[PDB]
Amino acid sequence: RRVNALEQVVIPGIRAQIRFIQQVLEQREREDTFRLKRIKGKIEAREAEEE
Amino acid sequence: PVQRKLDPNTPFLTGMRILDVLFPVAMGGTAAIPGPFGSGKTVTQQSLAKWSNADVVVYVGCGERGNEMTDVLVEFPELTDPKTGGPLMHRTVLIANTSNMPVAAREASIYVGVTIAEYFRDQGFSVALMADSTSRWAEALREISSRLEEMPAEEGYPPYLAARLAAFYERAGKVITLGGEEGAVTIVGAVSP
Amino acid sequence: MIQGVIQKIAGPAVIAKGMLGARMYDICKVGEEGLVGEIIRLDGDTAFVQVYEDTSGLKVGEPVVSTGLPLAVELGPGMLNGIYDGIQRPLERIREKTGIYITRGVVVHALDREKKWAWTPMVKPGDEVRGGMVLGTVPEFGFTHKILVPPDVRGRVKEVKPAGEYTVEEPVVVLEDGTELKMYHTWPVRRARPVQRKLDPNTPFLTGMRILDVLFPVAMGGTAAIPGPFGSGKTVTQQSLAKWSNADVVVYVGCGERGNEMTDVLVEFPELTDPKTGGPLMHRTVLIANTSNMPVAAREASIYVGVTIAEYFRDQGFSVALMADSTSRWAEALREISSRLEEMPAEEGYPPYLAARLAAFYERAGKVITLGGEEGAVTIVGAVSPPGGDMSEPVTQSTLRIVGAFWRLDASLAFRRHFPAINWNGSYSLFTSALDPWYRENVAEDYPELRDAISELLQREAGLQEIVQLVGPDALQDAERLVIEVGRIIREDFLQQNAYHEVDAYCSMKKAYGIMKMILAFYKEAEAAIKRGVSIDEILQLPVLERIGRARYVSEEEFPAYFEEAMKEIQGAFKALA
Amino acid sequence: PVQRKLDPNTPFLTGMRILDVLFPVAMGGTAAIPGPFGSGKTVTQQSLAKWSNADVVVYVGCGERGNEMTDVLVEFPELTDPKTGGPLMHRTVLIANTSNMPVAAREASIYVGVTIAEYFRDQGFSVALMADSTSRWAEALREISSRLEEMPAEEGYPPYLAARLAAFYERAGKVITLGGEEGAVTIVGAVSP
Amino acid sequence: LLKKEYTGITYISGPLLFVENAKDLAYGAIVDIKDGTGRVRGGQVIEVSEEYAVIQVFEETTGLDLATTSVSLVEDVARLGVSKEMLGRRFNGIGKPIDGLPPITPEKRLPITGLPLNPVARRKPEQFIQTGISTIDVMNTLVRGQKLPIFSGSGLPANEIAAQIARQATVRPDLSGEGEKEEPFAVVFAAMGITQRELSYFIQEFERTGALSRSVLFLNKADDPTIERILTPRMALTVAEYLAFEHDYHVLVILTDMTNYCEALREIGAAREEIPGRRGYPGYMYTDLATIYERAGVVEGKKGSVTQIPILSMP
Amino acid sequence: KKEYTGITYISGPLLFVENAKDLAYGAIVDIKDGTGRVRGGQVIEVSEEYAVIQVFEETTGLDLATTSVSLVEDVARLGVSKEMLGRRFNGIGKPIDGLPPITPEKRLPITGLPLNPVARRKPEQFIQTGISTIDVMNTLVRGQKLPIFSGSGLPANEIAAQIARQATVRPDLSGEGEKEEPFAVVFAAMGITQRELSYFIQEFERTGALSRSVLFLNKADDPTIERILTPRMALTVAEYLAFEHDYHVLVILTDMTNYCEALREIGAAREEIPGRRGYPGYMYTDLATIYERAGVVEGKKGSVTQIPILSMPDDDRTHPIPDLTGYITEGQIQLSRELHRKGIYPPIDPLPSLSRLMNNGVGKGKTREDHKQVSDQLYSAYANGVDIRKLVAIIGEDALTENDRRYLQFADAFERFFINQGQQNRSIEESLQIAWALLSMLPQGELKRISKDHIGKYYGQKLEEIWGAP
Amino acid sequence: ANEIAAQIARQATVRPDLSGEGEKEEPFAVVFAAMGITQRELSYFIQEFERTGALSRSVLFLNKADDPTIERILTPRMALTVAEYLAFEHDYHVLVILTDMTNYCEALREIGAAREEIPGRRGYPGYMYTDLATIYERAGVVEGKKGSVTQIPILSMP
Numbered sequence A: 001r002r003v004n005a006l007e008q009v010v011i012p013g014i015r016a017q018i019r020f021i022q023q024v025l026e027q028r029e030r031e032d033t034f035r036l037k038r039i040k041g042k043i044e045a046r047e048a049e050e051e
Numbered sequence B, D: 001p002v003q004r005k006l007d008p009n010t011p012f013l014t015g016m017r018i019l020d021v022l023f024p025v026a027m028g029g030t031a032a033i034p035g036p037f038g039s040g041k042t043v044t045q046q047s048l049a050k051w052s053n054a055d056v057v058v059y060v061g062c063g064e065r066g067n068e069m070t071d072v073l074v075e076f077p078e079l080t081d082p083k084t085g086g087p088l089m090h091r092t093v094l095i096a097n098t099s100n101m102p103v104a105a106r107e108a109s110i111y112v113g114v115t116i117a118e119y120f121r122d123q124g125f126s127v128a129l130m131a132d133s134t135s136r137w138a139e140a141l142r143e144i145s146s147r148l149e150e151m152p153a154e155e156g157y158p159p160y161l162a163a164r165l166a167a168f169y170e171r172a173g174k175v176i177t178l179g180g181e182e183g184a185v186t187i188v189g190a191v192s193p
Numbered sequence C: 001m002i003q004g005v006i007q008k009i010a011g012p013a014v015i016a017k018g019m020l021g022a023r024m025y026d027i028c029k030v031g032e033e034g035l036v037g038e039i040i041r042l043d044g045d046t047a048f049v050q051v052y053e054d055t056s057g058l059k060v061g062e063p064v065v066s067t068g069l070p071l072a073v074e075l076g077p078g079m080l081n082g083i084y085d086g087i088q089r090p091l092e093r094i095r096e097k098t099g100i101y102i103t104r105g106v107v108v109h110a111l112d113r114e115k116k117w118a119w120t121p122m123v124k125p126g127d128e129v130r131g132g133m134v135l136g137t138v139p140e141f142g143f144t145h146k147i148l149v150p151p152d153v154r155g156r157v158k159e160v161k162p163a164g165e166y167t168v169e170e171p172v173v174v175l176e177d178g179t180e181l182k183m184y185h186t187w188p189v190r191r192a193r194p195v196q197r198k199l200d201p202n203t204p205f206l207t208g209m210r211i212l213d214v215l216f217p218v219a220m221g222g223t224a225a226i227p228g229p230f231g232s233g234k235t236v237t238q239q240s241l242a243k244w245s246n247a248d249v250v251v252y253v254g255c256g257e258r259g260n261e262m263t264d265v266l267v268e269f270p271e272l273t274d275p276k277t278g279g280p281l282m283h284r285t286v287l288i289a290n291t292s293n294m295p296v297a298a299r300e301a302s303i304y305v306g307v308t309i310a311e312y313f314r315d316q317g318f319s320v321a322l323m324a325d326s327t328s329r330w331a332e333a334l335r336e337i338s339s340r341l342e343e344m345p346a347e348e349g350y351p352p353y354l355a356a357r358l359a360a361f362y363e364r365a366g367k368v369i370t371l372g373g374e375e376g377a378v379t380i381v382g383a384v385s386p387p388g389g390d391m392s393e394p395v396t397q398s399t400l401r402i403v404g405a406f407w408r409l410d411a412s413l414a415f416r417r418h419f420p421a422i423n424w425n426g427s428y429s430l431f432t433s434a435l436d437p438w439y440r441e442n443v444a445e446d447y448p449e450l451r452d453a454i455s456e457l458l459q460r461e462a463g464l465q466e467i468v469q470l471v472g473p474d475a476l477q478d479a480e481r482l483v484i485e486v487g488r489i490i491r492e493d494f495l496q497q498n499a500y501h502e503v504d505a506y507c508s509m510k511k512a513y514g515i516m517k518m519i520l521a522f523y524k525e526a527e528a529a530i531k532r533g534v535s536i537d538e539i540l541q542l543p544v545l546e547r548i549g550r551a552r553y554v555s556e557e558e559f560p561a562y563f564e565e566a567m568k569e570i571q572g573a574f575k576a577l578a
Numbered sequence E: 001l002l003k004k005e006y007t008g009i010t011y012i013s014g015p016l017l018f019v020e021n022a023k024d025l026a027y028g029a030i031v032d033i034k035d036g037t038g039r040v041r042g043g044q045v046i047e048v049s050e051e052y053a054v055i056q057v058f059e060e061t062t063g064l065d066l067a068t069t070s071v072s073l074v075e076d077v078a079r080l081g082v083s084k085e086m087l088g089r090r091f092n093g094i095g096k097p098i099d100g101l102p103p104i105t106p107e108k109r110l111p112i113t114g115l116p117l118n119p120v121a122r123r124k125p126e127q128f129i130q131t132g133i134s135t136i137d138v139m140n141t142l143v144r145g146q147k148l149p150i151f152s153g154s155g156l157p158a159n160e161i162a163a164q165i166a167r168q169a170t171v172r173p174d175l176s177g178e179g180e181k182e183e184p185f186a187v188v189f190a191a192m193g194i195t196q197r198e199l200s201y202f203i204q205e206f207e208r209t210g211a212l213s214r215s216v217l218f219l220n221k222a223d224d225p226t227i228e229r230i231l232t233p234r235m236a237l238t239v240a241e242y243l244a245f246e247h248d249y250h251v252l253v254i255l256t257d258m259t260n261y262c263e264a265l266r267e268i269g270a271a272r273e274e275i276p277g278r279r280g281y282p283g284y285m286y287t288d289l290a291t292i293y294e295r296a297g298v299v300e301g302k303k304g305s306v307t308q309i310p311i312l313s314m315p
Numbered sequence F: 001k002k003e004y005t006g007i008t009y010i011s012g013p014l015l016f017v018e019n020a021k022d023l024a025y026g027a028i029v030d031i032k033d034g035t036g037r038v039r040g041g042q043v044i045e046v047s048e049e050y051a052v053i054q055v056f057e058e059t060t061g062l063d064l065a066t067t068s069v070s071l072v073e074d075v076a077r078l079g080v081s082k083e084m085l086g087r088r089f090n091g092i093g094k095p096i097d098g099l100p101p102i103t104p105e106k107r108l109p110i111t112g113l114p115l116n117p118v119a120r121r122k123p124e125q126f127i128q129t130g131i132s133t134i135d136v137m138n139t140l141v142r143g144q145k146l147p148i149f150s151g152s153g154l155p156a157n158e159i160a161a162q163i164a165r166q167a168t169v170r171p172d173l174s175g176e177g178e179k180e181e182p183f184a185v186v187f188a189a190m191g192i193t194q195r196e197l198s199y200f201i202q203e204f205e206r207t208g209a210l211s212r213s214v215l216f217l218n219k220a221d222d223p224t225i226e227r228i229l230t231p232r233m234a235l236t237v238a239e240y241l242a243f244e245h246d247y248h249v250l251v252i253l254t255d256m257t258n259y260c261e262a263l264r265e266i267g268a269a270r271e272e273i274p275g276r277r278g279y280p281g282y283m284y285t286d287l288a289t290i291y292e293r294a295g296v297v298e299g300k301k302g303s304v305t306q307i308p309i310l311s312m313p314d315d316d317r318t319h320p321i322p323d324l325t326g327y328i329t330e331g332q333i334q335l336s337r338e339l340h341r342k343g344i345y346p347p348i349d350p351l352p353s354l355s356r357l358m359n360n361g362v363g364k365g366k367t368r369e370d371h372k373q374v375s376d377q378l379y380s381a382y383a384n385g386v387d388i389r390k391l392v393a394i395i396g397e398d399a400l401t402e403n404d405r406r407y408l409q410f411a412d413a414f415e416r417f418f419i420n421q422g423q424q425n426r427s428i429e430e431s432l433q434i435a436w437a438l439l440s441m442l443p444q445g446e447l448k449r450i451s452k453d454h455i456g457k458y459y460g461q462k463l464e465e466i467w468g469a470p
Numbered sequence G: 001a002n003e004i005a006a007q008i009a010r011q012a013t014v015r016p017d018l019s020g021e022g023e024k025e026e027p028f029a030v031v032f033a034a035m036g037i038t039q040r041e042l043s044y045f046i047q048e049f050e051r052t053g054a055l056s057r058s059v060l061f062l063n064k065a066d067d068p069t070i071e072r073i074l075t076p077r078m079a080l081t082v083a084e085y086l087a088f089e090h091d092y093h094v095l096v097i098l099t100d101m102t103n104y105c106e107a108l109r110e111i112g113a114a115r116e117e118i119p120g121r122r123g124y125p126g127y128m129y130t131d132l133a134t135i136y137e138r139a140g141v142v143e144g145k146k147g148s149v150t151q152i153p154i155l156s157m158p
């Protein structure tokens, strides 16, 4: 009974939690690099007003 | 404008046992019904349109299917009003803006519906307002902000989403109108995470 | 042609002014040293060129010259028995003039420009020529190389050189419009060569390893993938496919990987022998080799060069097998290049167009009718290396969507020294239902019906795995002991194969068919005897059991008499026992 | 400047059982104590100020509450120095920069404290230096880098943060002073993730 | 009509190129791009302003240069020539025949983006379809005018299910008495990024059934340019709408592997650096998908009907 | 000679210089202010308008009126000589031991040219490191790149010092005795503190190991571009010695985590967009240009062997630094914290360790012929012992069979004697003797992996020999 | 949370007989600062203060949910200014309640995002620590004075 419970119930929930946390962290990283991509373009646009 | 706002003290009867017994909502309150796809938000809202004891029902189909809007146009002119002998459609106002219709018009539909509901409140009626989906309004705001080159807060949403949502849900409540009469507006809004 | 000067240097990115008229993705010569690079962005009078090798030591004002052509390979005689890097530079001739290192800006030619060939013209003046036809033949090792016209060339033949000794540079056919046709031509690596029509994959591509071509077959012109961990057979199964398959010409493409792993295959391959002729295996293969420290552009463009060479050998009527080793490294190089272009990432840092590139690489395989009317096919086998065995990586997910076969390896069977160590409950093939009409005509009538028997017999033990780890095997009922023992002998005689053995390294299809027929005869007669209430211990001691083990090592010519004798013995054994 | 660095061979006694027995710190070594809010970081540092055997104690309050410095000023004059018998406050120097004080002064307080500690090192004393929070220094650097419009790394911190942190910690150690005496500075720094 | 050409290219990078003096190019027009070698590429205007106009290319930009490239206008709105003779033909996904037959003669020219149906003008779908599969007919029944995708896997046989559904679908009028005869479905088949192995299976099944004589195929193979993957379902839906609502046909639309369509959209969205969504997909994917799905249904006062069975693979 | 005075911008680690189009990209410059102090710098951008110089050290005291910039050299070069043996350098070639500077025989660019893949040959000889767990079960081969994975508090530095002090070649075991071969060790330290610097200084000189070693030592507070430059100079010296004097060299890279962090900071300073988890997108190629400089060359007698050392940030093997290293190197040696807390030194964990070039270095003619099967048997027995020890805590010692108790005792004896060697130096013969003595406690016939010929030749010795010095 | 805050404001008192300070008790003065409060909670707070009779001692700063967002920047500062003035000039014992700091943080994030400042975690501005410190750190007790300021902020965890 204990072996079957550990195989069928405990492990898949843990694995789903791993997947969910990984997705959240990756999505936050993508949101954070988007801002840097905007800011570099703003820096490049700033120093071109009259060279 | 109104004169005063009052405390809700009478139930808003929906006809569903679990909502009317375990999780009641008063006449003039607000509620939200989130859920994934296939859960049953639209059937729950159309049942509330059919069976509730509100005098005038306003339905706002903000950015959803067009077949759901044809079902209302076909079924309602035959059904019977719960509190009078007339047809059910004689008490209902529909504002329709489907998904393939222009995006920017999604924002205006919510304001039009809430202004009509407020107008019927001033006459002394009890009005029920049902928003089919507010996530589409949020997406319209996101697209406009993307065109404006604003800096997104989270998930691309503009940082002022919580102000607009707060301003929309505030308008509900039980008031004493400028004419001295009594009226109330209750809002039920669906969310599609 | 277009020339300019350097305006700004910042890492590998070079901005050259005065470049009005240059074309996108052309190859330029940057600096006085002769570095090469592609044009990636045009803006007014300037052009953004990214250099492959490092740019240290360059100064503002050094000239920049564009070649006017994109990245391309040279296709012609002399490519067999050769070793090239990712951009078709021969390493052997680089060694002769440089030493043990590779200096920057070295200039060598892919094809030898001073070797005499025996030209033989197959055309006469006045003949109409269109793209894809044959001008003549040139002998090369055990092959008769055909000199084709470029697909874009058409006209009328004016003069033809007579037979004799000529280099690849000497023009052999000149047309009426003044076009000169040599022994070689160039073709861009990112544009697919045209064909007349793509046929159906109705013929099987024979591997020579029993389990692959029996249970998970791949058709001619099909695509397959083979992922797995270290010590799992990835390398040995590929080099066995290279030797024992029915492909005429083999192309081995090695993306950027470990230096000693490259040294292993660079050393052992000249030792291998071609089974058809007994000569060296090097005489019919082309090698592309790249280490992890070579420029990233060569590593990224390595597989395109190999697939273009395979297409060129397909256009002459041969059957070509292409082996892409560790496409994960190619994906890593693509990720690095996309990072250098400041693209927005998706998933695990990969560019959003990874799946499009993987699809555009795999679709060049297939059996076609060439422009000259001959038939040919290209078969692609691509290895994938997961970081930790996770199948949720973007590369494996994108590969799974397009391949027709999926031979999953696992180290659990390699720990038991069970080779080949593929998992037979994780693998699948999609060419089974289309190969059946060929199967029931060329092999035997019952073969598609017989394969399901082996599959179900192997399946039934997977439903008995929940009781064997609890209760010992000997305590099982005889009706289940029979299934366990016959499945065991299946695993230890049919699934396993010794690639180093003299006769076990190659198995024809009728041999495997006889083995499955004989195993079914054993199982059916054993079940019939079990129905008569006998002990299963006397069944396990039967002399026919060693006849089952010995069936692997019989010669291909010697097999049928052995099969008939085994059939007689197994028919005599079971109904002699009461 | 100093004459020669030395190898640490004498323990720094704090009075805590677990820290003195299981995780010792030498006389010229460095240590860090990170943790979330409420873990006990500040109480540990004030106990170290109260009970350690260092000759002079320097406390640097980079960005914490003001009551934490009011407690030191109220309590310390009444206690007794373990190794001289006088009041405990006679051996303590406090540098205070509370949370609501201006941001740009956070960077200067760390350097002032470490410079005073190095000055007391040259006279032959052994000094213990404690920083209440080194994360607030990083936050101040981020705030200033935001105005400078330079591109940050990872969590918005400026790229040169690691060089500053390395240059701060390497001022510790047991030395031979220019006057021929021997001194030592030990640094304990709290981190607030 | 006279043609006009613009030669003032100023900037080329990736799929986008900038034209300086193109003041009179309408937003959303289709242009033809020609280089010095005579090759012709297509493109669409995606942003027009006083200073310049931005044009995205339908394929790769290899070979273009600022000196000899010229951009010529074709039409202000992307349109497709439709006709009744298109039944039994094959097209490459941008409107060109592949079968080698001469091109058709258009009856009308219609915009490929279509127009939204008026919700008042619709009617409720009511006719039950007997497909022959018990898990579908009894428990998930299909009605004429429904969009009902198949959520496939990586190696699951969804193509066989789609072919079997198309082979056996019938309306069964005897159970209602609202008609007679055996009025068959027309089939519109659109493939996006399909490979040769599945294309061969579909072609042989359609020829074996004999329904290829009343079907229109739009084929965009996996080695074709990626921007053509965007346009392919729109023209198929345009043909389906035209046939159903102008010749009273009952059409059935099959879209294969719209996951490829979604990655195709994501590539362009990343190139245009617009705001992303949940997993890097653009934030407007819901609207774009709605402009494809919501073109089915039935219309009051008309006999035709459109039915869609999309196919997609869950990652 | 020429000096540029057109400074127009100073902010943080960068400064701009006008009319500097004659400066080559990547050159090294000298910066002088009004007080005569001199700082270094490197050019990272050259343009028609201005050049961008990244400055070593802090920029305190600079001003736009008195600052001048002069060129040092166009390409970073290092002067090499055989006299570098026994010398200590600061990471950019400047001596710190107080001895006079060496006279260079040649000046080579520090960035190395790639080796031609057809010019390499397969590694075939081993190095005796003196550690039983490495020599017997994770053998290092001449030309291999075998990194060491360590935690935070684990003694990686002491293991590095012991390996550098004890490593030697064994020509007497190979063939007919071979012929005496020169040997040298190149040591590179990056991001170390003062305590580690002093420890290495005492360790390399207290036992005479300095006379055959070259030390490149870079402190934690030093400028971080020197941290980037240090391992390339170390590999340049190693390549020069090995391929121009037939030396057998061994290169130890003390901490690659500091190198990766310095690379990240430099990439952030030059306004690059980061990749995965903030790290630069080109880290794979940058690490490949360091690791792949080792190997052995056909037609030459020398060899280069690398032992990188890196500290895993959060014991996370999926971190980018361990992940990218695993794609290029041949196996790993992992230190175990559980063994470290129990008093065992060195805490090398045999179970997750692996050497991918073992099969080509061990065998007859280059070591004892029973090496491979003994290693396999030891691994398989320890794997059973560590699980039987866990089962004991639940089901008790009595419920086991006899052979399970033998395995349980074998695991304890293995951990006590084989791994825990202390500071001793063990030859390969002594390690094999101890291994065969440990296998002797198992009954004959339980050793499935070993053939009968070696079992009849070596089985049966007692463990009392090593019990005199545990 | 609002009911607990109202109960605390209703029942809180010192115990001079235990501490021995001797001074007989006088009630707290309440300063109430609401940011983005709804009518449903505002009516409850008003009725509770009416029933407990504390409106004669209380100053209320109200910023309702439909009021403009940027006004939330100023309200806590003026509430604490009035509390500081009363406590440290007229020796009152002042209790301060802030209804929702989350609505203050959203109003700060809007201005931060409109100004293109470098964000911290989850898009909030990097200087939010200092801005929140300038609000919380205005409470405490001053040597040589009778007054005191006590703060009970309320915030909703997302």
Ligand SMILES: Nc1ncnc2c1ncn2[C@@H]1O[C@H](COP(=O)(O)OP(=O)(O)O)[C@@H](O)[C@H]1O
Pocket: B035, B036, B037, B038, B039, B040, B041, B042, B043, B044
């Ligand atoms: N109260 C209910 N009784 C019976 N069926 C229901 C009920 N609520 C939902 N359903 C079922 O849910 C299905 C679709 O739900 P729907 O209203 O579309 O949810 P959503 O709009 O959120 O996707 C309908 O086919 C209906 O059969």
Ligand SMILES: Nc1ncnc2c1ncn2[C@@H]1O[C@H](COP(=O)(O)OP(=O)(O)O)[C@@H](O)[C@H]1O
Pocket: C229, C230, C231, C232, C233, C234, C235, C236, C237, C419, C420, C497, C498, C499, C500
């Ligand atoms: N069919 C086979 N027959 C014999 N040995 C095999 C077979 N397949 C794999 N091996 C063994 O596996 C080892 C590892 O080879 P392989 O896994 O192909 O390369 P890699 O480990 O680089 O993937 C080889 O030493 C070989 O002896």
Ligand SMILES: Nc1ncnc2c1ncn2[C@@H]1O[C@H](COP(=O)(O)OP(=O)(O)O)[C@@H](O)[C@H]1O
Pocket: D036, D037, D038, D039, D040, D041, D042, D043, D044
């Ligand atoms: N050694 C200790 N003995 C008793 N209580 C302690 C000890 N350390 C911490 N605490 C309790 O834990 C709390 C931690 O507070 P403090 O250290 O000031 O905050 P922070 O760690 O967040 O800076 C204190 O209120 C104190 O009561």
Ligand SMILES: [Mg+2]
Pocket: B041, B042, B064
């Ligand atoms: Mg709905």
Ligand SMILES: [Mg+2]
Pocket: D041, D042, D064
């Ligand atoms: Mg604290």
